[PDB]
Design an enzyme around this catalytic site. Structure first.
Site, PDB file in Angstrom:
ATOM      1  N   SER A 143       3.889  -0.019   2.466  1.00 49.46           N
ATOM      2  CA  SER A 143       4.985  -0.470   2.118  1.00 49.46           C
ATOM      3  C   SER A 143       5.813   0.439   1.000  1.00 49.46           C
ATOM      4  O   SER A 143       7.013   0.497   1.130  1.00 49.46           O
ATOM      5  CB  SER A 143       4.617  -1.846   1.358  1.00 49.46           C
ATOM      6  OG  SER A 143       3.466  -1.812   0.320  1.00 49.46           O
ATOM      7  N   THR A 157       0.792  -1.290  -0.180  1.00 53.10           N
ATOM      8  CA  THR A 157       0.106  -0.057  -0.104  1.00 53.10           C
ATOM      9  C   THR A 157       0.812   1.206   0.031  1.00 53.10           C
ATOM     10  O   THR A 157       1.937   1.121   0.622  1.00 53.10           O
ATOM     11  CB  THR A 157      -0.848  -0.032   1.406  1.00 53.10           C
ATOM     12  OG1 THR A 157      -1.768  -1.075   1.313  1.00 53.10           O
ATOM     13  CG2 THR A 157      -1.681   1.393   1.327  1.00 53.10           C
ATOM     14  N   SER A 158       0.203   2.351  -0.817  1.00 53.53           N
ATOM     15  CA  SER A 158       1.068   3.714  -0.792  1.00 53.53           C
ATOM     16  C   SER A 158      -0.032   4.660  -0.532  1.00 53.53           C
ATOM     17  O   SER A 158      -0.934   4.625  -1.135  1.00 53.53           O
ATOM     18  CB  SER A 158       1.627   3.610  -2.197  1.00 53.53           C
ATOM     19  OG  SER A 158       2.699   2.856  -2.352  1.00 53.53           O
ATOM     20  N   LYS A 176      -8.467   3.092  -0.255  1.00 51.72           N
ATOM     21  CA  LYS A 176      -8.180   3.114   0.893  1.00 51.72           C
ATOM     22  C   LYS A 176      -8.127   4.446   1.677  1.00 51.72           C
ATOM     23  O   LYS A 176      -7.745   4.879   2.728  1.00 51.72           O
ATOM     24  CB  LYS A 176      -6.327   2.924   0.742  1.00 51.72           C
ATOM     25  CG  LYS A 176      -6.278   1.850  -0.149  1.00 51.72           C
ATOM     26  CD  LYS A 176      -4.890   1.500  -0.249  1.00 51.72           C
ATOM     27  CE  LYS A 176      -4.500   0.221  -0.954  1.00 51.72           C
ATOM     28  NZ  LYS A 176      -2.998  -0.205  -1.218  1.00 51.72           N
TER      29      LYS A 176
END
Ligand SMILES: */C1=C\C(=O)NCCCC[C@H](NC(=O)[C@@H](NC(=O)N[C@H](C(=O)O)C(C)C)C(C)C)C(=O)N[C@H]1C(C)C
EC number: 3.4.25.1
Lengths: 196, 244, 233, 243, 244, 204, 222, 250
Positions: A129, A1-2, A33
């Site tokens: 991440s 995930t960013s 998200k």
């Protein structure tokens, strides 16, 4: 995930990729998200989805009851509830949450809640991440009080990179603008951000 | 505080009596009469249906005779609602005994448990006793045919013939007047109905106002059997015993 | 009237009174007189011990709660034991946890809140005892008067118990005098014995009858009985 | 025996006096209120009486926002009014959380009514001396008015009134509807429905109002809000230029 | 019938709660205390009767602070007063801990309000024998509040309770009229001392001791503090002067 | 180690033409040690039959439980429970112990007294219900039984034939399993009568 | 197990295979993996069989009661919320992976829940060991705005992918169509592409083949 | 706080009566009439919607309620008490039966369940009995159709037909005259409407009357298709329009 949150001249912007994987498999390539806890207080979820969703859901409920009784809550207070949940249950949670909200007096505010359940208020914060790959970049390109466009670019670039290097990130980039003018959803597709 | 509204349902009277148990009994004295007669080859349970109507669906009804086990049943006198609450726990108790020992619960044992439960509402809790009295009719291989009775007090005793509810005194006299140790089920069946017939607060003793039950050991088998007569079965036996 | 509003502490009388509490306060008046007074260096307690027969002992009126705090009781002995014992724990907890001596003023606030709880909940009963707490802390010497109602008050001196009014007037008069008795415990004590004899009547304070206690600057709360008080009678 | 009037147990008449006395307390404030249904809004008018000059007028109110969509006006003492409000608010938030959608005005009423019913059957809980009028523009039912009382009763209305002169306001409204033949104020804007409400409130009570003698609450699609002294003033001026 | 005033949660036939009403008696009987809401804070003052020269002066403090920005003063049963403040303190602490921000005066008000109202719901508890004037500065200004044993409370420009409650309410109203533009924290402290001195006439028998405390955005940085020393004497004087 | 493999045993139910059959072995041993050659694993409550394979103690228990339940059920419902319902009872009964199950594999067989229809069903140790229209297998030799059944079996067998079929499946499957055998019993259930036979088989 | 969800222009459809397994052995050759939560809200579940069933019924039972209490139609988001909070309460210990769908007053919906309690939303979803085979088909043929028929084909094709290409999946294709305006139509065994071929021989034994030791009749009548 | 009412509020008087239960029944007497009729192929229950204000909308309130898809209930007494009793009766049906056997409880048992609830409010500490009487009607495979009446005492009994509330004595008499063991459902519906008219003062139409039935399976009311064994609910409340039509053949 960013995921990242950037405060600027007119408020704040939240951004994220839409990839949620279970191992090497992309279980969802269009994930959102970016979650709404209040009218102008949203959060960025990274870590377990079952956990960030459960935490978010509970927070929204707390802010709803809060409003019912004492009117609109501050962005700080929202960070405070998230923190309380994350810190108090640190042993059974895997949630890295960024809390961003627009205030009229305070303008834009960003609180990052890392794995330990501590809280940090900053001009902008990155997480997930993919975040590791863009520390240097974001540190070298962020500026305070950027315009809505500069900030949408800053986020667009930063995340396109994180998506580039991190396999746990990808899909589309989603943003949410929070200013006195209301709330605005923005979406950017691979074909657009890839060649940046 | 709350003490202001506490009836103290579990205290002694200056005479050493238990108010509520007494009053509860008072209530039962107005309930349809239930009679239990025990003969050498079986037991009989007869009761009078309190309040009936043309519209009352009698085939689907039961307000006095309840099956607890396969070898045990009871006749009620008092608050039906209360009775049930106790009957259900009785039915369960029987099963547990079976599950633990793999043997059918001895009649007296079931009766003692039920009585103990009542006795409790009598010594602690601050709640009202159960407005019920039971006539237990059952059979086990240790005491054969048995007949017991228990009431709100929590005490229980055995009988050859007994009744509960209204006009018990009248019935007891009549039973005590015509009972004989060497009676036969049929005999008991008659004596039962005759007694009700003479105590009934109603005009005539018709089938639609009765509930009957017999625990006999159908010779052509060797096992004991519980028979809870259906409307028609009562209507018949009623004509036979000469009450048409 | 009163008969319908005094069956428990959870009932107010049409006038705003809590009788059960007042009845408790009575138990205090029925209690043996005890006096408390303080200067700027010391605080003192003087109490009249009452005995049953002449074959019985005289019951203790003074209790130590810590090295810097103590009190005298008037009323239901048991309740004093309960309350003093609870005040001992609080001093104790203040040390063990903060390595800090429980200020007299706070000890009072604690007692008050403890008492108050037995005057608003069904089933509870007020405490039938009055207390006079003396103590030396970071702000000097102190005197407190505890009433079962929960009312705790800081005074220069005072008394409670039968005929207490006698001593109290005497102190109220002697005020400007004993308050300046610094650097001299014996003087503050004699002024205390005088105040108390002002509430005598039945007899006169004897050796196994008088009870004195004192706390102060370099003086740990210490109780004196019998022969020890002889030099004051 | 004579305590069948102190706690919620039956009287030989089969009545619950404590419940009745509860109702009696609802008028303790001497304030009347009414609710009407617009074409697609719901308005609740309530009298506002601030006698003391030391009071801060702005802090006085018997109108509550239970949620973004549900509003509630209470007829009865304020401390019981707030205990009720809070509980409803909580009940509202919890419902959303558990079921994933905003609690419908009628359901909230039913839940509060059931809650009242309990104080009616359990001895240690006293009823609350209040009548609760819940209003909203339900996403499934349209404009809604649901009122509950100390007896644990509730129902939906075309319009309704509560307080001392309840009957005057009711019959006034009853008449208006017997006339119009429809179960609602055929008006598009709520401002007009607000004016309608205020108007008949005047006709029925035979009294004139100033911006500070009223309290107004409006419920529209996805939002319930209360008016201000000025919002009302502007509304009062409106009815004035028609009379 | 009658007896509708022996239990706390009972509704009289006219819809009242006498117990609560009897509580108010205990209050009115108490000392007088006021609250004045200036243009950027609130001032609190109270009457401290000197029962005797034995009371160490300046010692038995009445006004209490909740957290760091709220002030409480009450008339009636002091112990009940403290009990309430303790709850308020826990109440405020619980709030801050979860929302970080120190509890808003209004929210705190209803926090005490719901608690108090809670004691008019059961016969197992007694209502509070105190009326409480409290307030402070928060995110949006100053707020003054008064809470009654019934649990009722509203926001006031000025408030008073106790023995001299009327003299006060009289004076407070005068202020409100002669100051439409507002009173300053400095001025409210003075005016308060006067208003206390006047209200002391309905108790002119025993001598007293004044006690003022304020919470001003410009004077105390939104923190509640006791007015002491010079500023205090200065007010005692401004009052002593106008009482003649 | 594996509870379901301490005692051994197997059960298998089969449907036929207006009839159902259920059979089991008689072995009860501890690991390799054979202990009882008389441990039947099939029980019945009214006209509903239940076979239980697995840890013998749980087998015993589950039977005692269902008796208790079916008895009370009859007292209250005033009728004997049906296979379909019982199946549901059994299922919920097991799932009630979701995180500490009984180590059993229950097989239900019967004919609905009101519909006349034949019925069989299997459950995993936590209630998962398998309602087959042909056959159900359970036990340490369940694989062998699947192979036996999947081949041997054919629809609408007459009672007399279904008996031969179910017996051969049970019998041959059991012989290929060290923990099964030592005797066997087969039930042939019809709307009116129910016949129980004991088979002759290897004793090793 | 292969289960999928696919929304179309006026509703939503869900499909699944019918194979149940314990290890490499097929327990049920034709079980139903489609659960009804309410007349118009159906759930397709993968994972621990017993769990998908029990959890499905539990939330169903409550959805029913709630519906009666609120006098309103059940909403998909209600079952989604109830399920998820339940699964989450159980730290993933209740092995249920579900695709929940249906139509209610607010429109047509499609979600998926994972045993740990997280939820997703989309126009097409698949879960189970055939998840990937199915998803390939979906990623290859789904387009925005599908007709009810297009949707059913797509869904059914995805399930096939699994049956054929996944060893944990097989047998038939069960479908349930939930169209905004009508009643939900559940099509049990909408496809049965795996009927066993007639056996080579009949294995009916000649009566008397089995050796019997003893015999007797059983008493069922009490 | 804390319910210190841990003692019974319903006790035996020297006469042997249970005050509160008696008073509760009195409360039932005062309530609007409602009745029940069992036909050979169905059951019908109905009452009057006594709108307590012309402004109130009687539809937003049902005196006739569905307990299970084959069991309905109607009362006489204190509306609010009935309300919570319904919710409880709906839940208890699941918790103590459908969740264990996967099928809805048969009428007698569900009734038996509700009875127990009331029975307890007659003996538990700190409570009063329920001020209502219920008329439950339903159908189950092994019992056919049935009608039961449940009293605040916790007692219940089966009826071929009966009524409770206000003019019960009157209506009960009228039913004994019109009932027979050969009535078809439509017959009972008619008799029902007649029996009701007597107890009705003012308006008598589909908007003032509330009546439901327990007849044949309504697959059209199921909500979904595809499952042979699921045929639909036997319970069905009549519509205002459906009522008026029948009233013309009155
Ligand atoms: C969908 C396939 C899938 O999701 N996973 C494949 C693994 C097996 C899951 C499930 N099978 C069963 O539930 C078995 N029973 C058990 O697995 N019992 C467990 C055990 O004994 O280890 C206990 C711990 C629950 C069958 C016999 C019921 C399966 O077949 N899943 C399918 C679909 C949901 C039917």
């Amino acid at each position: 995930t960013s995921i990242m949150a950037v405060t600027f001249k007119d408020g704040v912007i939240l951004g994220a990729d839409s990839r949620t994987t279970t191992g090497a498999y992309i279980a969802n390539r269009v994930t959102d998200k970016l979650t709404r806890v209040h009218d102008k207080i949203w959060c960025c979820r990274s870590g377990s989805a079952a956990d960030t969703q459960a935490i978010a859901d509970i927070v929204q409920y707390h802010l709803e009851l809060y409003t019912s009784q004492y009117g609109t809550p501050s962005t700080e207070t929202a960070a405070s509830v998230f923190k309380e949940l994350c810190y108090e249950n640190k042993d059974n949670l895997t949630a890295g949450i960024i809390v961003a909200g627009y205030d009229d007096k305070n303008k834009g505010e960003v609180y990052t809640i890392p794995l330990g359940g501590s809280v940090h208020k900053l001009p902008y914060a990155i997480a997930g991440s993919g975040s590791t790959f863009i520390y240097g970049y974001c540190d070298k390109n962020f500026r305070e009080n950027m315009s809505k466009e500069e900030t949408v670019d800053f986020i667009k670039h930063s995340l396109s990179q994180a998506i580039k290097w991190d396999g746990s990130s990808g899909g589309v980039i989603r943003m949410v603008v929070l200013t006195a003018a209301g709330v605005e959803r923005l979406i950017f597709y691979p074909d657009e951000y890839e060649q940046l | 505080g709350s003490r202001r509204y506490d009836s103290r349902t579990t205290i002694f009277s200056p005479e050493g009596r238990l108010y509520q148990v007494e009053y509860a009994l008072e209530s039962i004295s107005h309930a349809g009469t239930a009679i239990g007669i025990m003969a050498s080859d079986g037991i009989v349970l007869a009761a009078e249906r309190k309040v009936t109507s043309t519209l009352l669906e009698q085939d689907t009804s039961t307000e006095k005779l309840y099956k607890l086990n396969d070898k045990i049943a009871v006749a009620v006198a008092g608050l039906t609602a209360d009775a049930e609450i106790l009957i259900n726990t009785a039915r369960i108790h029987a099963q547990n005994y079976l599950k633990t020992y793999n043997e059918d619960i001895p009649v007296e044992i079931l009766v003692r448990r039920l009585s103990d439960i009542k006795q409790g509402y009598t010594q602690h809790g601050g709640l009202r006793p159960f407005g019920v009295s039971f006539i237990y009719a059952g059979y086990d291989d240790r005491y054969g045919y048995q007949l017991y009775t228990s009431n709100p007090s929590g005490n229980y005793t055995g009988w050859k013939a007994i009744s509960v509810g209204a006009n018990t005194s009248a019935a007891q006299t009549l039973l005590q007047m015509d009972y004989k140790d060497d009676m036969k089920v049929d005999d008991a069946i008659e004596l039962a109905l005759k007694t009700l017939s003479k105590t009934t607060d109603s005009s005539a003793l018709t089938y639609d106002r009765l509930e009957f039950a017999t625990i006999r050991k159908g010779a052509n088998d060797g096992e004991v059997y519980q028979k809870i007569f259906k409307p028609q079965e009562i209507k018949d036996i009623l004509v036979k015993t000469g009450i048409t | 009237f009163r008969n319908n509003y005094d069956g428990d502490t959870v009932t107010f009388s049409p006038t705003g009174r809590l009788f059960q509490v007042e009845y408790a306060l009575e138990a205090i008046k029925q209690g043996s007189v005890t006096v408390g007074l303080r200067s700027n260096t010391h605080a003192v307690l003087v109490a009249l011990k009452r005995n049953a027969d002449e074959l019985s002992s005289y019951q203790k009126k003074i209790i130590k709660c810590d090295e810097h705090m103590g009190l005298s009781l008037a009323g239901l002995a048991p309740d004093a034991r309960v309350l003093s014992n609870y005040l001992r724990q609080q001093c104790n907890y203040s040390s063990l946890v903060f390595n800090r001596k429980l200020a007299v003023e706070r000890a009072g606030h604690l007692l008050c809140d403890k008492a108050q709880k037995n005057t608003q909940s069904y089933g509870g009963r007020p405490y039938g005892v009055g207390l006079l707490i003396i103590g030396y802390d970071k702000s000097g010497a102190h005197l407190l008067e505890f009433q079962p109602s929960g009312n705790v008050t800081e005074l220069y001196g005072t008394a409670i118990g039968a005929r207490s009014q006698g001593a109290k007037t005497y102190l109220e008069r002697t005020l400007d005098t004993f308050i300046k008795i610094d650097g001299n415990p014996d003087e503050l004590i004699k002024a205390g014995v005088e105040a108390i004899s002002q509430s005598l009547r039945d007899e006169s304070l004897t050796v196994d009858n008088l009870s004195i206690a004192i706390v102060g600057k370099d003086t740990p709360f210490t109780i004196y009985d019998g022969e020890a008080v002889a030099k004051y009678i | 025996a004579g305590y069948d009037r102190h706690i919620t147990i039956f009287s030989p008449e089969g009545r619950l006096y404590q419940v009745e006395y509860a109702f009696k307390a609802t008028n303790q404030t001497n304030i009347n209120s009414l609710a009407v249904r617009g074409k697609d809004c719901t308005v609740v008018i309530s009298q506002k009486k601030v006698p003391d000059k030391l009071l801060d007028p702005t802090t006085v109110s018997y109108i509550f926002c239970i949620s973004r969509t549900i509003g509630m006006v209470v007829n009865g003492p304020i401390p019981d009014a707030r205990n009720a409000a809070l509980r409803a608010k909580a009940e509202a938030a919890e419902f959303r959380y558990k079921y994933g959608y905003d609690m419908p005005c009628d359901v909230l009423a039913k839940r509060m009514a059931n809650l009242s019913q309990i104080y009616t059957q359990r001895a240690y809980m006293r009823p609350l001396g209040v009548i609760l009028t819940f209003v909203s523009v339900d996403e499934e039912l349209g404009p809604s008015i649901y009122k509950t009382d100390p007896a644990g009763y509730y129902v939906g209305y075309k319009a309704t009134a509560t307080g001392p002169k309840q009957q005057e306001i009711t019959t006034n409204l009853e008449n208006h509807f017997k006339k119009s033949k429809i179960d609602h104020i055929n008006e598009e804007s709520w401002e007009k429905v607000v004016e309608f409400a205020i108007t008949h409130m005047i006709d029925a009570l035979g009294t004139e109002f100033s911006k500070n003698d009223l309290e107004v609450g409006v419920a529209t699609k996805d939002k319930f809000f209360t008016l201000s002294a000025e919002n009302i003033e502007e509304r009062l001026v409106a009815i004035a230029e028609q009379d | 019938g009658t007896g509708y005033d022996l239990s706390n949660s009972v509704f009289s036939p006219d819809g009242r709660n006498f117990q609560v009403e009897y509580a108010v008696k205990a209050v009115e009987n108490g000392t007088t205390s006021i609250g004045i809401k200036c243009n950027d804070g609130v001032v609190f003052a109270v009457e401290k009767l000197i029962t005797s020269k034995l009371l160490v002066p300046q010692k038995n403090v009445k006004i209490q602070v909740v957290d760091r920005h709220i002030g409480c003063v009450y008339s009636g049963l002091i112990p009940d007063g403290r009990h309430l403040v303790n709850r308020g303190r826990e109440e405020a602490a619980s709030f801050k801990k979860l929302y970080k921000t120190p509890i808003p005066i209004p929210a705190f008000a209803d926090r005490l309000g719901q608690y108090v109202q809670a004691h008019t719901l059961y016969n197992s508890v007694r209502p509070f024998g105190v009326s409480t004037i409290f307030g402070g500065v928060d995110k949006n200004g100053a707020h003054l509040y008064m809470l009654e044993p019934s649990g009722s409370y509203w926001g006031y420009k000025g408030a008073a309770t106790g023995k001299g409650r009327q003299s006060a309410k009289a004076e407070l109203e005068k202020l409100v009229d002669h100051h439409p533009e507002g009173l300053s924290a400095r001025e409210a402290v003075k005016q308060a001392a006067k208003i206390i001195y006047l209200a002391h006439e309905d108790n002119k028998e025993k001598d007293f001791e004044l006690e003022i405390s304020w919470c001003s955005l410009s004077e105390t940085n939104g923190l509640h503090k006791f007015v002491k020393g010079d500023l205090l004497q200065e007010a005692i004087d401004f009052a002593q002067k106008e009482i003649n | 180690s594996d509870p379901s493999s301490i005692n051994g045993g197997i059960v298998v139910a089969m449907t036929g033409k207006d009839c159902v059959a259920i059979a089991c072995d008689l072995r009860l041993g501890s690991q390799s040690l054979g202990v009882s050659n008389k441990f039947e694993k099939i029980f019945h409550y009214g006209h509903v039959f239940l076979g239980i394979t697995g840890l013998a103690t749980d087998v015993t228990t589950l039977n005692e439980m269902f008796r208790y339940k079916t008895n009370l059920y009859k007292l209250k419902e005033e009728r004997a429970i049906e296979p379909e319902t019982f199946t549901q009872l059994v299922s919920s009964s097991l799932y009630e112990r979701r995180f500490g199950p009984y180590f059993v594999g229950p097989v239900v067989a019967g004919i609905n007294s009101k519909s006349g229809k034949p019925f069989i069903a299997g459950f995993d140790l936590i209630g998962c219900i398998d309602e087959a229209k042909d056959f159900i297998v359970s036990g340490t030799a369940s694989d062998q039984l699947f192979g036996m059944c999947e081949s041997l079996y054919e629809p609408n067998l007459e009672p007399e034939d279904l008996f031969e079929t179910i017996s051969q499946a049970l019998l041959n499957a059991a012989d290929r399993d060290a923990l099964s055998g030592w005797g066997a019993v087969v039930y042939i259930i019809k709307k009116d009568e129910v016949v129980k036979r004991y088979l002759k088989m290897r004793q090793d | 197990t292969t289960i999928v969800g696919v929304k179309f222009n006026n509703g939503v459809v869900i499909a699944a295979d019918t194979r149940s397994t314990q290890g490499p052995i097929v327990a049920d050759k034709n079980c139903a993996k489609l659960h009804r939560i309410s007349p118009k809200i159906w759930c397709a579940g993968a994972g621990t069989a017993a769990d998908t069933e029990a959890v499905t019924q539990l939330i169903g039972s409550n959805i029913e009661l709630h519906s009666l209490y609120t006098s309103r139609e059940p909403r998909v988001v209600s079952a989604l919320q109830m399920l998820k909070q339940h699964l989450f309460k159980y730290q993933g210990h209740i092995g249920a992976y579900l695709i929940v769908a249906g139509v209610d007053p607010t429109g047509s919906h499609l979600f998926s829940i994972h045993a740990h309690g997280s939820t997703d939303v989309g126009y097409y979803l698949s879960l189970g060991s055939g998840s990937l085979a199915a998803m390939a088909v979906l990623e290859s043929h789904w387009k925005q705005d599908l007709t009810k028929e297009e949707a059913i084909k797509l869904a059914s094709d995805a399930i096939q992918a699994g049956i054929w290409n996944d060893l944990g999946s097989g047998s038939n294709v069960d479908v349930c169509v939930m169209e905004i305006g009508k009643d939900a139509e559940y099509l049990r065994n909408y496809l049965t592409p795996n009927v066993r071929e007639e056996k080579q021989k009949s294995y009916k034994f000649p009566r008397g083949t089995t050796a019997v030791l003893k015999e007797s009749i059983v008493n069922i009548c009490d | 706080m804390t319910d210190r009412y841990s003692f019974s509020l319903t006790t035996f008087s020297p006469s042997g009566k249970l005050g509160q239960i008696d008073y509760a029944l009195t409360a039932v007497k005062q309530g609007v009439t409602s009745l029940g009729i069992k036909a050979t192929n169905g059951v019908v229950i109905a009452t009057e919607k006594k709108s307590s204000s012309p402004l109130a909308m009687s539809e937003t309130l049902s005196k006739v309620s569905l307990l299970t898809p084959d069991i309905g209930a109607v009362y006489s007494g204190m509306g609010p008490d009935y309300r919570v009793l319904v919710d409880k009766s709906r839940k208890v049906a699941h918790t103590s039966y459908k969740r264990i056997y996967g099928e809805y409880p048969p009428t007698k048992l569900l009734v038996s369940e509700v009875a127990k609830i009331m029975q307890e409010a007659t003996q538990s500490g700190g409570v009063r009995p329920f001020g209502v009487s219920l008329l439950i009607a339903g159908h189950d495979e092994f019992n056919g159709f049935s009608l039961y009446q449940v009293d605040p005492s916790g007692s219940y009994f089966p009826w071929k037909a009966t009524a409770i509330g206000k003019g019960s004595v009157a209506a009960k008499t009228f039913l004994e005259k019109r009932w027979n063991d050969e009535l078809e459902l439509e017959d009972a519906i008619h008799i029902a409407l007649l029996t009701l008219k007597e107890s009705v003062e003012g308006e008598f139409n589909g908007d003032t009357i509330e009546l439901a039935i327990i007849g044949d399976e309504n697959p059209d009311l199921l909500g979904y298709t595809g499952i042979p064994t699921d045929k639909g609910p036997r319970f069905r409340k009549l519509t205002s329009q459906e009522i008026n039509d029948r009233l013309e053949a009155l």
